[PDB]
Coordinates of N, CA and C and ligand atoms in Angstrom, one line a residue:
Chain A
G882 N -28.8 5.2 23.4 CA -29.0 6.2 22.3 C -29.8 5.7 21.1
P883 N -31.1 5.9 21.1 CA -32.0 5.4 20.0 C -31.5 5.9 18.7
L884 N -32.3 5.5 17.6 CA -31.9 5.9 16.3 C -30.5 5.6 15.9
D885 N -25.9 0.8 15.1 CA -24.5 1.3 15.3 C -23.6 1.2 14.1
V886 N -22.7 0.3 14.1 CA -21.8 0.1 13.0 C -22.5 -0.8 11.9
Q887 N -22.9 -0.2 10.9 CA -23.6 -0.9 9.8 C -23.0 -0.5 8.4
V888 N -22.9 -1.5 7.5 CA -22.3 -1.2 6.2 C -23.3 -0.6 5.3
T889 N -23.3 0.7 5.2 CA -24.2 1.4 4.3 C -23.5 2.3 3.3
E890 N -24.2 2.6 2.2 CA -23.6 3.5 1.2 C -23.3 4.9 1.9
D891 N -24.2 5.2 2.8 CA -24.1 6.5 3.5 C -22.8 6.6 4.2
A892 N -22.5 5.6 5.0 CA -21.3 5.5 5.8 C -20.1 5.5 4.9
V893 N -20.1 4.7 3.8 CA -18.9 4.6 2.9 C -18.7 6.0 2.3
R894 N -19.8 6.6 1.8 CA -19.7 7.9 1.2 C -19.0 8.9 2.1
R895 N -19.5 8.9 3.4 CA -18.9 9.9 4.3 C -17.4 9.6 4.6
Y896 N -17.0 8.4 4.7 CA -15.6 8.1 4.9 C -14.8 8.5 3.6
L897 N -15.2 8.2 2.4 CA -14.5 8.5 1.2 C -14.5 10.0 0.9
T898 N -15.5 10.7 1.5 CA -15.5 12.2 1.3 C -14.5 12.8 2.1
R899 N -14.2 12.3 3.3 CA -13.2 12.8 4.2 C -11.8 12.6 3.7
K900 N -11.5 11.4 3.1 CA -10.1 11.2 2.6 C -10.0 9.9 1.8
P901 N -9.1 9.9 0.8 CA -8.9 8.7 0.0 C -8.7 7.4 0.9
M902 N -9.3 6.3 0.5 CA -9.1 5.1 1.3 C -8.9 3.9 0.4
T903 N -8.1 2.9 0.8 CA -7.9 1.7 0.0 C -9.1 0.8 0.4
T904 N -9.2 -0.3 -0.3 CA -10.2 -1.3 0.0 C -10.0 -1.8 1.5
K905 N -8.7 -2.0 1.8 CA -8.4 -2.5 3.2 C -8.7 -1.4 4.2
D906 N -8.5 -0.1 3.9 CA -8.8 1.0 4.8 C -10.3 0.9 5.1
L907 N -11.1 0.8 4.1 CA -12.6 0.8 4.2 C -13.1 -0.4 5.0
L908 N -12.5 -1.6 4.7 CA -12.9 -2.8 5.4 C -12.6 -2.7 6.9
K909 N -11.6 -2.0 7.3 CA -11.3 -1.8 8.7 C -12.3 -0.9 9.4
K910 N -13.1 -0.2 8.7 CA -14.2 0.6 9.3 C -15.4 -0.2 9.6
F911 N -15.5 -1.4 9.0 CA -16.7 -2.2 9.1 C -16.3 -3.6 9.6
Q912 N -15.7 -3.7 10.8 CA -15.2 -5.0 11.3 C -16.3 -5.9 11.7
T913 N -16.1 -7.2 11.3 CA -17.0 -8.2 11.6 C -17.3 -8.4 13.1
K914 N -16.3 -8.0 13.9 CA -16.5 -8.1 15.3 C -17.6 -7.2 15.8
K915 N -17.9 -6.1 15.1 CA -18.9 -5.1 15.4 C -20.2 -5.4 14.7
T916 N -20.2 -5.8 13.4 CA -21.4 -6.1 12.6 C -21.9 -7.5 12.9
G917 N -21.1 -8.4 13.1 CA -21.5 -9.8 13.3 C -21.6 -10.5 11.9
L918 N -21.3 -9.7 10.9 CA -21.4 -10.2 9.5 C -20.2 -11.1 9.2
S919 N -20.3 -12.0 8.3 CA -19.2 -12.9 7.9 C -18.4 -12.1 7.0
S920 N -17.1 -12.5 6.7 CA -16.3 -11.8 5.8 C -16.9 -11.8 4.4
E921 N -17.6 -12.8 4.0 CA -18.2 -12.9 2.7 C -19.4 -11.9 2.6
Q922 N -20.2 -11.8 3.6 CA -21.3 -10.8 3.6 C -20.8 -9.4 3.5
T923 N -19.8 -9.1 4.2 CA -19.1 -7.8 4.3 C -18.6 -7.4 2.9
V924 N -17.8 -8.3 2.3 CA -17.2 -8.0 1.0 C -18.4 -7.8 0.0
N925 N -19.4 -8.6 0.0 CA -20.5 -8.5 -0.9 C -21.3 -7.2 -0.9
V926 N -21.6 -6.7 0.3 CA -22.4 -5.5 0.4 C -21.5 -4.3 0.1
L927 N -20.2 -4.3 0.5 CA -19.3 -3.2 0.2 C -19.1 -3.1 -1.3
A928 N -19.0 -4.3 -2.0 CA -18.8 -4.3 -3.4 C -20.0 -3.6 -4.1
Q929 N -21.2 -3.9 -3.8 CA -22.4 -3.3 -4.4 C -22.3 -1.8 -4.2
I930 N -22.0 -1.4 -3.0 CA -21.9 0.1 -2.7 C -20.8 0.8 -3.5
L931 N -19.6 0.2 -3.5 CA -18.5 0.8 -4.3 C -18.8 0.8 -5.8
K932 N -19.5 -0.2 -6.3 CA -19.9 -0.3 -7.7 C -20.8 0.9 -8.0
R933 N -21.8 1.1 -7.2 CA -22.7 2.2 -7.5 C -22.1 3.6 -7.3
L934 N -21.2 3.8 -6.3 CA -20.6 5.1 -6.1 C -19.5 5.3 -7.2
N935 N -18.9 4.3 -7.6 CA -17.8 4.4 -8.6 C -16.9 5.6 -8.3
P936 N -16.3 5.5 -7.1 CA -15.4 6.6 -6.7 C -14.2 6.8 -7.6
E937 N -13.6 8.1 -7.5 CA -12.4 8.4 -8.3 C -11.4 7.5 -7.7
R938 N -10.4 7.1 -8.5 CA -9.3 6.2 -8.0 C -8.0 7.0 -8.1
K939 N -7.4 7.1 -6.9 CA -6.1 7.8 -6.8 C -5.0 6.9 -6.3
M940 N -3.8 7.1 -6.9 CA -2.6 6.4 -6.5 C -1.9 7.1 -5.4
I941 N -1.9 6.6 -4.2 CA -1.2 7.2 -3.0 C -0.3 6.1 -2.4
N942 N 0.9 6.4 -2.2 CA 1.9 5.5 -1.6 C 1.9 4.2 -2.5
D943 N 1.9 4.4 -3.8 CA 1.9 3.3 -4.8 C 0.7 2.3 -4.6
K944 N -0.4 2.8 -4.1 CA -1.6 2.0 -3.9 C -2.8 2.8 -4.3
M945 N -3.7 2.1 -5.0 CA -5.0 2.7 -5.5 C -5.9 2.9 -4.3
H946 N -6.4 4.2 -4.2 CA -7.3 4.6 -3.1 C -8.6 5.1 -3.7
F947 N -9.7 4.8 -3.1 CA -11.0 5.3 -3.6 C -11.1 6.7 -3.0
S948 N -11.8 7.6 -3.7 CA -12.0 8.9 -3.1 C -13.2 9.7 -3.7
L949 N -13.9 10.4 -2.8 CA -15.0 11.2 -3.1 C -14.6 12.6 -2.6
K950 N -13.3 12.8 -2.3 CA -12.8 14.1 -1.8 C -12.5 14.9 -3.0
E951 N -13.5 15.6 -3.6 CA -13.4 16.5 -4.7 C -12.4 16.1 -5.8
Chain B
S1146 N -3.0 -11.3 6.7 CA -4.2 -11.1 7.6 C -5.5 -11.4 6.9
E1147 N -6.6 -11.3 7.7 CA -7.9 -11.6 7.2 C -8.4 -10.4 6.4
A1148 N -7.9 -9.2 6.9 CA -8.3 -7.9 6.2 C -7.7 -7.9 4.8
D1149 N -6.5 -8.5 4.7 CA -5.8 -8.5 3.4 C -6.6 -9.4 2.5
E1150 N -7.0 -10.6 3.0 CA -7.8 -11.5 2.2 C -9.1 -10.9 1.7
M1151 N -9.8 -10.3 2.7 CA -11.1 -9.7 2.4 C -10.9 -8.6 1.3
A1152 N -9.8 -7.8 1.4 CA -9.5 -6.7 0.5 C -9.3 -7.3 -1.0
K1153 N -8.6 -8.4 -1.1 CA -8.4 -9.0 -2.4 C -9.7 -9.5 -2.9
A1154 N -10.5 -10.1 -2.0 CA -11.8 -10.6 -2.4 C -12.7 -9.5 -2.8
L1155 N -12.6 -8.3 -2.2 CA -13.4 -7.2 -2.5 C -13.0 -6.6 -3.9
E1156 N -11.7 -6.4 -4.0 CA -11.2 -5.9 -5.3 C -11.5 -6.9 -6.5
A1157 N -11.4 -8.2 -6.2 CA -11.7 -9.2 -7.2 C -13.2 -9.2 -7.5
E1158 N -14.0 -8.9 -6.5 CA -15.4 -8.8 -6.6 C -15.8 -7.6 -7.4
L1159 N -15.1 -6.5 -7.4 CA -15.3 -5.3 -8.1 C -15.1 -5.6 -9.6
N1160 N -14.4 -6.6 -9.9 CA -14.2 -7.0 -11.3 C -15.4 -7.7 -11.9
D1161 N -16.5 -7.5 -11.2 CA -17.8 -8.2 -11.5 C -17.8 -9.7 -11.3
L1162 N -17.5 -10.1 -10.0 CA -17.5 -11.5 -9.7 C -18.9 -11.9 -9.1
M1163 N -19.0 -12.3 -7.9 CA -20.2 -12.7 -7.3 C -21.0 -11.4 -6.9
Ligands
ZN872 ZN1 -11.5 14.6 -8.2

């Protein structure tokens, strides 16, 4: 299937638009086993993305979740 | 877990780390 799992702002935005997610929830969507990225590279690019998006922060189950869900 | 470590590292990174 031309044109897989890559850490992009587009992907993060789509996940956060669907539902609030913690940092751990998001990291689970971009597993190193699929990207081949080291844990450090993964944390670094996700940080840049989350910084730019600056998602709303909601407390759910006593835990801060990022959210672009209105 | 490793996910837990990465999450702390990400959250700490958001505090303007590396
Ligand atoms: Zn809102």
